[PDB]
Amino acid sequence: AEKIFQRVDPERKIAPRLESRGCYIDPLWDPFKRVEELQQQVAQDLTEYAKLVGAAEARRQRLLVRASLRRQYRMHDPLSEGHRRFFGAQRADPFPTPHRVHERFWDPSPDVRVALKNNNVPISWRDLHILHHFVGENGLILPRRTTHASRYQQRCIFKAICMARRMALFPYDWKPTQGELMPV
């Protein structure tokens, strides 16, 4: 389920977007309506504040509920890692996928996929905040099998990074710093 959900929107990360449910769930048929009714009930049910035992003990009990909800805050996300920790289940063992693949099949990461398009603008030497991804620890140029980019843009990227180094605007044996991640 996690992998099949990335094809619908490869430019974003999967998340519980509860704030945009209207475009997928009818307002009248919203299952969240139950919460509203339920939440009001819990408050109303706390008639013991001062009826029987008084405020003395009421306060004590209030802390109990806060703890309970905080502990169980991870229960609302089965796809998240929190679910597994709660139940205490062993990790998965996916089949070993070969590293060498034909060019027809490629699944670039969402974070780097958006940077490649650059709003339909070819990458140049001015785009310093994008060239930092296409460089290793030693500062060498990565191959076409790692960055997962097309043949035409692969040559253009090599030119932009090469020129930036000549201008003393890019490192030579290490990765850039946080103070140099800005376009020209």
Partner: peptide, 18 residues
């Protein structure tokens, strides 16, 4: 949370009434 709350409430009333 509601279930426990309700149940607890009734226990105090029975003891207090005597």
């Amino acid at each position: 949370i509601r279930s426990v709350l309700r149940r607890m409430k009734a226990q105090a009333e029975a003891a207090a009434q005597q």
